[PDB]
Design a protein around this ligand. Structure first.
Ligand SMILES: [Cu+2]
Ligand SMILES: [Cu+2]
Ligand SMILES: [Cu+2]
Ligand SMILES: [Cu+2]
Lengths: 467, 467
């Protein structure tokens, strides 16, 4: 007549949860079928002076418990001053590192820093290619994103984004529109290397915090080049191959990239009432532009349903909803048209924001995150992806972040992360009747979490297609 | 249809688990009633450049949820280089910090490094005074131990310990016997502060490891003064006041000291084939010696029964046993006589060593760890503490560390630490029928944990009386 916590985990199946801990310094693999941490890694170990450990993604493995590979980045610079911790390192390391890490069935071995190898340092999202032959990072202080080869860790293409405001005052620089340029970067050092590790190429001094467009507008984000920010956040991929979509927060657009031919081919328009798309203009071999008349809202979260037949981009703060296109046509992104929009009283005021999402395998539902600043209950809301409405919402706790799903599609498993100073959990939730089965210790402030995929098809619902 | 983990947690009651994480750099507090981490702190945030977060202890709090205080201490220097981990840090800091931290019902808040206050820095067990008006810290590098004020963090009294060996050859220097000095240690800088923060005082470059007496003997441990080493481990407290007892690892003894009178009063003799005690000789007002014919076996873990009717000391490596004294005469420690010796047929090898214990509140059972070098499964033995015999041994998995108990007596709560590169976990066993209830994620490397106690009474079974 005593309850064994093992009974809990029995129901979860043979999956491996991984997560980085932001100010914690750590990355951690957990075995849901038992409750142990398989392994963990403290990057201070490795002389890293600002081991803000940030986004990660993992390669599909035939047996994750035997071995698997992952990628996880870091932030530095004025990133350390932007949470509520009264940190003491006045002058931190710059981060912007792209670690390569293998769990080999025992432990995690630090393989290298990919930004030393390539010479390109990025510190926001990391995704895996749908072929698992590579991976991608985005970045929001230097506004560059990049697809990298898995073996060589060299950049396959990088794309810089620059904002030229119609009205040259922070106060109107986005609202009153302008023109963004899409700039094909090229190595500048010998052996195909870039010169962009670290705070090198930062337009601003931290990635924007949520509703941070208000902040930079008000002159409150230090950097050399803020009038020039577009704030890239991600680079995600088409389950079907060929395409990748770069996400730009502040001009609320997404730009569709021909990966093999390395060219941009469409710019998807975020805010409800806009067209489907803005017009891509080519200046030369390495420079396109887009004309944005005004910026009604900033965007954040972007990605594809698992069969790629639907593209999503979330409007946040000024508007709060899910903007949705028909990406059905795989041969031609310029034809992707607005298909629906998901609104709800759930999105009450400026907050909550919806920054993260995972689908079900069967592209019928999505679980999406609800973020408030403290103390407002953060939670999950569940999306009917066939009719496009909110089914329900569940309150959970402080500072919701990412979500992942078991590959059998059974349990959702997210990380709540105490605003880097308070309560942090793993949350489990069953897809069947959308009940919160409850929480597991997690003394880390996760901005990322995945479950190790086995198959290429598993990826389609992992950090590849969404963030 | 689905199992909720909250059913599991509902049975444990309202206790807070607190734990440091070693090479993790972090300390975590965990709500056993809900599964959440209440708050965590990453020392690197506070300019700690070798945050090996070691021992800790927690002050009684009327309501832990609302607020509580702890002591947690770091190690440094070549302690970095000791484990599986291919650490890469050019300039480790020295460790030896004694941090004060304060959970305010939402976050932890670093209040002070006390060794900067006192100027004495010690890196091995933390204990809480039985009156909860103070703490004590031991160290086996400097071989100092000291009690501190809670309010001032200033040293009440401090003792230092020197080996003068019979045979001046490292290999023979404990086994053929020797004389141990016990000195009053007295401060050197203005405002009665000590000149002994960080590495100053280190006679060896790291805390010996399990088996570590073979390394020291073997010339394998560096430092200025190995022949002089006694490796003080802890300064643990008589739950009934007056005494504290200083565990000495290489001389296989425990020293018993009058707290308010700062003299030693008794040397207890650890191994099988020794008297209950050896002779104290006063050399002068500040100093004392004891002659030990030969060190039959090194010892380690040591403390009292909750009613301190019993005092205990483990033989480790050369013997593996639990030596028990009749400490019932609280009047006069030199009256204390060995009464029982707990042994079992599977303690006959070098391994496993028993370094930690917890007692049930009524005193009739102990819980004790079974540590091994990988890959052999570490464990918990249950000790009948009226008959003094082994009751049950349970396999658990790698690198068992410390144990604490719920104060209602029903759940034992332990830590496994994956030798700092593999599996780590919190473990819960129930004390009714000594079944293992299972495991919780603990991505850290705990060599300590506590349940926040609520009365001076709970302290008799916490990080006060045992380690
Ligand atoms: Cu994002
Ligand atoms: Cu982040
Ligand atoms: Cu010890
Ligand atoms: Cu330790």
């Amino acid at each position: 007549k005593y309850v064994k916590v093992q009974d809990f985990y029995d129901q979860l199946g043979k999956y491996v949860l991984v997560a980085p801990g932001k100010f914690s310094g750590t990355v951690a693999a957990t075995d849901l079928s038992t409750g142990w941490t398989m392994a963990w890694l403290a990057a201070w170990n490795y002389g890293d002076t600002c081991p803000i450990m940030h986004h990660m993604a993992a390669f599909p493995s035939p047996d994750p418990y035997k071995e698997f590979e992952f990628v996880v980045n870091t932030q530095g610079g004025k990133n350390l001053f932007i949470y509520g911790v009264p940190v003491a390192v006045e002058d931190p390391g710059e981060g912007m590192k792209i670690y390569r890490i293998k769990y080999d069935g025992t432990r995690m071995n630090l393989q290298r820093d990919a930004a030393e190898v390539s010479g390109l340092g990025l510190g926001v999202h990391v995704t895996i290619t749908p072929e698992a032959d590579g991976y991608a990072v985005g970045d929001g202080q230097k506004d560059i994103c990049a697809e990298f080869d898995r073996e060589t860790d060299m950049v396959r293409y990088a794309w810089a984004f620059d904002w030229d405001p119609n009205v040259k005052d922070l106060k109107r620089a986005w609202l009153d529109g302008g023109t963004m340029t899409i700039k094909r970067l090229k190595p500048t050092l010998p052996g195909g290397r870039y010169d962009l590790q670290g705070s090198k190429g930062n337009k601003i001094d931290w990635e924007l915090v949520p509703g941070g467009e208000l902040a930079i507008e008000d002159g409150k984000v230090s950097g050399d080049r803020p009038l020039h920010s577009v704030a890239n956040d991600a680079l995600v991929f088409d389950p079907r191959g060929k395409w990748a979509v770069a996400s730009m927060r502040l001009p609320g657009v997404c730009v569709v990239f021909d990966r093999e031919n390395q060219v941009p081919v469409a710019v998807l328009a975020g805010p409800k009432g806009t067209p489907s798309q803005f017009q891509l203009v080519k200046v030369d071999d390495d420079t396109w532009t887009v004309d944005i008349p005004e910026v009604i809202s900033a965007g954040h979260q972007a990605g594809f349903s698992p069969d790629g037949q639907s593209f999503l981009f979330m409007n946040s703060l000024r508007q709060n909803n899910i903007m949705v296109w028909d990406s059905s046509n795989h041969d031609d992104p310029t034809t992707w048209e607005k298909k629906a929009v998901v609104e709800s009283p759930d999105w009450r005021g400026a907050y909550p924001n919806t920054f993260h999402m995972v689908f079900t395998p069967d592209a019928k539902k999505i679980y999406v995150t609800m973020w408030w600043p403290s103390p407002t209950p953060n939670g999950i809301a569940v999306i009917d992806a066939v009719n496009w409405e909110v089914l329900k919402e569940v309150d959970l706790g402080p500072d919701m972040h990412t979500l992942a799903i078991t590959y059998d599609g059974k349990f959702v498993v997210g990380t709540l992360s105490g605003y880097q100073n308070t309560a942090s959990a793993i949350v489990v939730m069953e897809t069947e009747t959308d009940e919160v089965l409850g929480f597991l210790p997690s003394p880390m402030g996760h901005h990322d979490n995945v479950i190790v995929p086995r198959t290429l098809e598993d990826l389609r619902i992992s950090r590849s297609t969404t963030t």
